Amino acid sequence: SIWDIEKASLLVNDCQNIANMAEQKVMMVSAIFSESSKDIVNPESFSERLGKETVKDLYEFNEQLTTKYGLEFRTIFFSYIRKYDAYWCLFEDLEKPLKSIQFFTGLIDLLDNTNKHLTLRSIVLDALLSADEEDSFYGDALVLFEELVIRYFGTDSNPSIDASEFILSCLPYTSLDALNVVCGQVWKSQKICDFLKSTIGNTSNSPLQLRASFPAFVNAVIHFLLEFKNVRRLE
């Protein structure tokens, strides 16, 4: 996929500002989650507690973000930005506010009552693709990845899909091979793709669906988006 260069260019201009409104809604959603960390039993409950108007506003801000700035895969891809020179130059300075925008796109995806969490899937895979650097922040991404896998295949209204489709449908890349072209060291070195294809195969075969509790899921998501937020991804 090609990120519209004009729209991405607009994002450079409105970056710090959209980032600010973004961190507003994060602090809200996160504060509201702090009150009810045991009554929020599922995304739908997260929704009711937030309020329709808060929710409606949440989706409208995400809509403008998505349409105006060309984010076809719903969020920001640091692997993509690091890979393609034109985008690197455009964004190399703006890593801090980019992390904020992505956080927002991650957090509100917790509201997806289909449990597909396409945006969280994107963010986790992007993290997995980005890391060459020595980190155990990787480990956390693998774990969160297995949870998203449970959440997807544990919901019986979600169609059976291959590991390939599960991975690529949320990435601005066209094939599994292509991922080898844009990834960091860890992806190739630890044969990460095979681990994911394995995990995905076993989770949809297993009668055990040891899904985590939502408030624990949410807390792990918030935690993970926070670690990400103090990591230097752009080279």
Residue ranges in contact with Co ion by CB under 5 A: 210
Q: How far apart are CA 120 and CA 175, in angstroms?
A: 20
Q: 149 is in the binding site of which of Co ion, Mg ion, none (Cβ under 5 to 8 A by kind)?
A: none
* Closer by beta carbon to Mg ion, 53 or else 177: 177
Q: Which residues make Cβ contacts (< 8 Å) with residue 127, sequence separation at least 6?
A: 78, 137, 138, 141, 228
CB of 164 to Co ion, least distance (A): 23
| Beta carbons of 40 and 121 less than 8 angstroms apart | no
Q: How is residue 108 written in tokens?
A: 């509100």
Nearest residue to Mg ion on Cβ basis: 168
CB of 221 to Co ion, least distance (A): 15
Nearest Cα neighbor of 119 from 163, 57, 170, 56 is 170
Q: 168 is in the binding site of which of Mg ion, Co ion, none (Cβ under 5 to 8 A by kind)?
A: Mg ion
CB of 210 to Co ion, least distance (A): 4
Exposed / middle / buried, residue 159 (Cβ in 10 Å: 0-12, 13-18, 19+): exposed
The amino acid occupying position 108 is I
Residues that contact Mg ion, how many (by CB under 5 A): 2
* Closer by beta carbon to Co ion, 2 or else 143: 143
Residue 178: DSSP 8-state: H
* Closer by beta carbon to Co ion, 184 or else 215: 215
* Closer by beta carbon to Mg ion, 168 or else 231: 168
CB of 150 to Co ion, least distance (A): 7
Contacts (CB under 5 A) with Mg ion, residues 162-181: 168, 171
Contacts (CB under 5 A) with Mg ion, residues 123-162: none
Q: 231 is in the binding site of which of Mg ion, Co ion, none (Cβ under 5 to 8 A by kind)?
A: none
Q: 210 is in the binding site of which of Co ion, Mg ion, none (Cβ under 5 to 8 A by kind)?
A: Co ion
Place of tokens 């890979």: 83
Place of tokens 């922040």: 137
- CB crowding 81-119: b at 16 or more within 10 Å, else e: bbbeeebeebbeebeebbbbbbbbbbbbbbbbeebbbbb
Contact residues for Mg ion, defined by CB under 5 A? 168, 171
